[PDB]
Amino acid sequence: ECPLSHDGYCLHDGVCMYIEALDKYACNCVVGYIGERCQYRDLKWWE
Amino acid sequence: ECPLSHDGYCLHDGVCMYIEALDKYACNCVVGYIGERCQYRDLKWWE
Amino acid sequence: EKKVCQGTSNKLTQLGTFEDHFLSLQRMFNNCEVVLGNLEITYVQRNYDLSFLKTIQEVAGYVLIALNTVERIPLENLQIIRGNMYYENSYALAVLSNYDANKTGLKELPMRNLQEILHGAVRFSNNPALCNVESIQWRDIVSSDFLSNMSMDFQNHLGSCQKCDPSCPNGSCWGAGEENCQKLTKIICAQQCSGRCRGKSPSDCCHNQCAAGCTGPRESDCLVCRKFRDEATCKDTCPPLMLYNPTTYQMDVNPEGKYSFGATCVKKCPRNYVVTDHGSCVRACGADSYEMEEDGVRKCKKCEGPCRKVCNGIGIGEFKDSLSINATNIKHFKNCTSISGDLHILPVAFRGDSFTHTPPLDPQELDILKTVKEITGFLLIQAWPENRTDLHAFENLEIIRGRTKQHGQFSLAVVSLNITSLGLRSLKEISDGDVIISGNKNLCYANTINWKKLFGTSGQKTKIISNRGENSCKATGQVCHALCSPEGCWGPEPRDCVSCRNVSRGRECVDKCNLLEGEPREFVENSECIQCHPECLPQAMNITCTGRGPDNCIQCAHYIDGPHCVKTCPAGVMGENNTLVWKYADAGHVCHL
Amino acid sequence: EKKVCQGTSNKLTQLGTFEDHFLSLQRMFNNCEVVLGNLEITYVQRNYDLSFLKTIQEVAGYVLIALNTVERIPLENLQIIRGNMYYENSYALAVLSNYDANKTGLKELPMRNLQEILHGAVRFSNNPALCNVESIQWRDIVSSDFLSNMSMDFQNHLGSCQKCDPSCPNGSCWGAGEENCQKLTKIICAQQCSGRCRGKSPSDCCHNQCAAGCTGPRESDCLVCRKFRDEATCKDTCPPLMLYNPTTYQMDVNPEGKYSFGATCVKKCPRNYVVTDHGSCVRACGADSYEMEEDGVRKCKKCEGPCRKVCNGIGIGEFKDSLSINATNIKHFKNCTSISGDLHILPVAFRGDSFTHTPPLDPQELDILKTVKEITGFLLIQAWPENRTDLHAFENLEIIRGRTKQHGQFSLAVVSLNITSLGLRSLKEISDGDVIISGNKNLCYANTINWKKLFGTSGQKTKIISNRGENSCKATGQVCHALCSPEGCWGPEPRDCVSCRNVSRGRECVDKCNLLEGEPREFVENSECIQCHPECLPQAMNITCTGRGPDNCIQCAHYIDGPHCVKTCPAGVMGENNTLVWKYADAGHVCHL
Ligand SMILES: *[C@@H]1O[C@H](CO)[C@@H](O[C@@H]2O[C@H](CO)[C@@H](O)[C@H](O[C@@H]3O[C@H](CO)[C@@H](O)[C@H](O[C@H]4O[C@H](CO)[C@@H](O)[C@H](O)[C@@H]4O)[C@@H]3O)[C@H]2NC(C)=O)[C@H](O)[C@H]1NC(C)=O
Ligand SMILES: *[C@@H]1O[C@H](CO)[C@@H](O[C@@H]2O[C@H](CO)[C@@H](O)[C@H](O[C@@H]3O[C@H](CO)[C@@H](O)[C@H](O[C@H]4O[C@H](CO)[C@@H](O)[C@H](O)[C@@H]4O)[C@@H]3O)[C@H]2NC(C)=O)[C@H](O)[C@H]1NC(C)=O
Ligand SMILES: *[C@@H]1O[C@H](CO)[C@@H](O)[C@H](O)[C@H]1NC(C)=O
Ligand SMILES: *[C@@H]1O[C@H](CO)[C@@H](O)[C@H](O)[C@H]1NC(C)=O
Ligand SMILES: *[C@@H]1O[C@H](CO)[C@@H](O)[C@H](O)[C@H]1NC(C)=O
Ligand SMILES: *[C@@H]1O[C@H](CO)[C@@H](O)[C@H](O)[C@H]1NC(C)=O
């Protein structure tokens, strides 16, 4: 979705995506990480 | 006017007096001194 | 006190699937009234329910409703949007692109109690099905500063909604019903109302610190506070400790002195914060001062010349927009012993990143962090290379204050590592937050540590669970060294004990300080081994020495000078009136004058 | 800025005759609007006029109208009575015993603008002819605290006055006419007015800091201020230098930081005051701190252990009710170098006083005041014994700040003495007030002193007049020593010069520092004589030495050690690695190794 200039932007095997209705970039984290670019560990629930 | 227990209360040759309508004591300074008991030198006017 | 929650920081980040993000949003905002972080409603698909969002009454950040094809979002009790951090550096209420592939997205947004956004503006974009919101006059809700920063966009080529009820001023309503009408607070005021009011009558002027509205003329009748709060009233400034005297030109002690903490004026600052001379609860003082020794609370005093080069942590100061300790900022952590912020260790430093084109972080380079002794923020260790098996960088870390916290609950996170042991042998005080050590592989190492002795604030817990086996690791040398005290132990080394059983030579747990044998001559005080002066003779029958000074030797080694035991007699030491003292020995080695 | 005056402090003291007191009252209160002291209307007999009292609009103390048989006292513009110092420790408006021998005293008192006394109550006693004042409801004028401290007394057995005009509420009027009616400010308010208002309508609520009344809803529409003033507005607290941040938990710099000075919030403190960290202009800091070195302004920093024993002056602190330095308080001025107040010298200390039964003050005992070096208040020297002819106690006084002033105009008064000279040889700075030296007998001594170099604040004058002859004293050795510089001289001694002509040996004005003759070996720098090291040889052909060190001798006296000139060679001085250095002399006296 998002072009090749943003490789490695979404950490912890999260996939990068491009929202074209807002002209913005977004991440998709795995279960256990939150944040803008999958950088915050989910400490409150499930380790 | 005022009794003998308040001798020297009014400085710089000021005379002591007793106000009986208020049951209080007062001084009479010479020209050149103000204050409660003639203790403040008149510095603003006439030396 | 209202129910608080920290919220999320997900701008547009979906969490796994749609159901996983929906469950995370459900678990984040259940029974929350004051959102200290950000209200972020993203990725809520059709046939869902959002009844848990009805209790939110205060958001301290930006409200971001994006990509939501659900029919109704009941934000019915949202009375104030503070907006401490903006969205797109200009907005605090952004509803963005709520439509599916069939152009049927968000339909109703009944923000019945939204009356003023303090800092921020309104950004609506690409909302075809969102009706009954464009009729709201946004002059009441936006502040007097941001009339030009606002931007509106609507699409009304649907024709599926209805109009307002004819019992409300200027035809303004949020949804279906007479209860969904906008309560006008500013534009219907008279000339004499300086801020906002209730009705068109001039006798309804509210207080200045009443942000949304007022239930009366007094400052105790405000619904929500504007800046500060004296616990039932809303205030501009907290009452300081010292009030000025216009008569005697002095500074008198105020009996009602309240310390400013956040949006509140508390009676006293907490333990891990800093009390200033102005009467405030701060995290860091000025550049010309330093936080000095605690006399019960933490103050600040001036330094000589320039102060110490204080390292700004991750997320505050010059490193505010940063996210991890990387190859650039690690040169700034050279010679500082007090971290005024966070120390985040992420896999982005060790794996590499082409978005900034930086070289990856080196494991030997982390020895620049050997001199770290104090962390005011929270510690987040998340990545570690497979070479070293011990956290050798944090070997001198003593006190973790935890003035900022991850999720407002945790302050020490050591997760997902290939380490063997922890090695935190100098950690003596954790004043805030919970400590979680989980998601690891070769680290059991926790059943002896009494965390209540390290917790400086009551009401804290831990989640050290699901590490390794819980019955199979403990038979392969997992139990630490046998000279550790049962109060706790960090690693299997004899020096990694928390305290010792009998004596502690420096850091090593020994049974005795070499009484009647051993090469060094040591004694016992404060359960520690301390060497004496080397002119004590080694006695193998009785004890050797008691104190550190040379007067405490029982028998001198070579020479004796009164009570002192000395190697050589004084033969030219500086005396009095140009007399260098000549002293000669005796048959009992007494240095005679 | 309104016209200010300091007023009088005469409680019941008549000044000479009735005409002399009337002329003093006339000269004191002409063209005054803000009375910072006390409004004291006493001893005004019949057939007089008091039209100069119409311009007074603010009294910061107690109003005392006593023994006044004049018919009318027009206090028509008195809008506020602050009352910083009470009368009988309870009142601030006392009208007391206005009647003659024929029981015809004060008749009318038209206080048309008196609406609220802030601190104080009302005491009326023994006023037979005072009509049209007892009908005034005093609930509006007294504060909400002093409802029980008030006391009223009237005599209505005259029947000479008339009633009020039937166009005013509740029949309240101060005098004859419809313009003399009381403007009710509090008792006619509604429920929503927190303080005071204008009319019976609920839409007239004024600001809290509007003391008397308001001309509108804003805080800039107050007539007079309650506590503080931002220069067109009336405020509770001045805006400080640092405002608290509820977001980042910090202390940000306020661009609108105003320093609190009295009832005003000025932009910066003046020269002789103290700037605090809270943003105030004070006279003295706390007991745990001291006023440190000026960096343009005066700050305060903490001391180690206890601070210096600061001597409280006459009229402030523990010596507030005192009036002179007497035989009791002089033991408290033992070892202090900074006087935080006044140093009054009165004839009551040297003549004796049986009201307290204290022994008189001794002239040798004034040497306890030898260590006085700084006066923050004003100096009032008024008495001196006929033995000593010089003010030898103030020989180390350096800077007179003058933070408080006699009559608000004068800070250094040396009057009515039997001294010969002044002897103020160390007085370097007078930051406030005028300097008057008059009423003396044997003291001309003033025509050379340039007072503008000592005045630290512009707009000051002096009244050194009518001392001795002005042409006859100046031919009998009145002119000071001929080596004084023409900048000024205090006494006839060679050391009492302000500055010197050529050089100054310590304090003595010399032409040169013993070049080519003289017993001490001295050089010239900063127009001063400085001795050298005694191992410089005395040369009678050329100069001797240049600098203070032993390297600056041209020829050594006895021994030479490189560049140094020394008495003895080093024969056992401490060196390095246990080597006491033996040095032997040469034929040229060079101490060789
Ligand atoms: C490793 O740590 C590095 C520590 O410096 C880190 O570098 C930081 O990366 C951030 C990524 O978002 C930057 O925000 C941050 O500072 C930026 O520097 C730019 C220089 O021109 C500024 O222009 C920028 O200002 C604005 O830019 C962003 C762009 O999206 C705006 O959204 C934002 O509102 C902001 O105001 C900003 O100041 C940068 N730090 C420094 C000192 O440059 C690096 O990213 C880390 N990660 C790696 C290497 O993977
Ligand atoms: C020489 O200097 C002396 C400095 O101590 C000075 O002594 C002071 O004289 C003042 C004259 O009025 C006193 O006010 C002052 O303190 C008083 O001490 C009294 C002891 O009992 C207190 O009772 C008194 O309290 C109240 O008394 C007066 C009485 O009229 C009230 O009017 C007033 O409101 C007050 O509240 C007050 O505290 C006194 N200082 C000390 C330490 O005693 C002395 O008068 C000077 N002059 C001489 C010797 O001629
Ligand atoms: C929120 O938590 C409460 C626990 O008190 C629970 O009863 C409720 O069902 C939760 N909300 C949702 C939407 O599940
Ligand atoms: C938005 O408001 C800010 C004030 O906070 C100011 O920069 C300007 O008015 C607006 N900014 C832009 C970029 O339009
Ligand atoms: C007050 O002073 C002015 C000078 O400006 C003078 O004209 C006036 O007569 C004085 N007042 C009285 C009552 O003399
Ligand atoms: C007068 O008021 C004061 C408060 O300032 C208090 O002492 C008391 O209420 C009154 N005093 C007396 C002596 O009645």
Author numbering:
A (entry chain C), B (entry chain D): 5 to 51
C (entry chain A), D (entry chain B): 27 to 619
List sentences from the manuscript.
HER2 is unique within the HER family in that it does not have known ligands and cannot assemble into ligand-dependent homodimers. Thus, to facilitate downstream signaling, it must either form heterodimers with other HER proteins once their specific ligands have bound or self-assemble into ligand-independent homodimer under the condition of overexpression.
During 3D classification, both the EGF-bound EGFR/HER2 heterodimer and EGFR homodimer were present in our dataset, in nearly equal particle amounts. Unlike the perpendicular orientation of the EGFR homodimer, the ectodomains of the EGFR/HER2 heterodimer were tilted with respect to the detergent micelles; this structural discrepancy between the homo- and hetero-dimers helped to distinguish between these two subclasses. Finally, the complex structures of the EGF-bound EGFR/HER2 and homodimeric EGFR ectodomains were refined to 3.3 Å and 3.8 Å resolution, respectively. In comparison, the buried surface areas (BSAs) for the corresponding regions of the EGFR homodimer are only 535 Å2 and 327 Å2. Our results showed that both DAs of individual EGFR protomers were crucial for EGF-induced EGFR dimer formation, consistent with their symmetric organization.
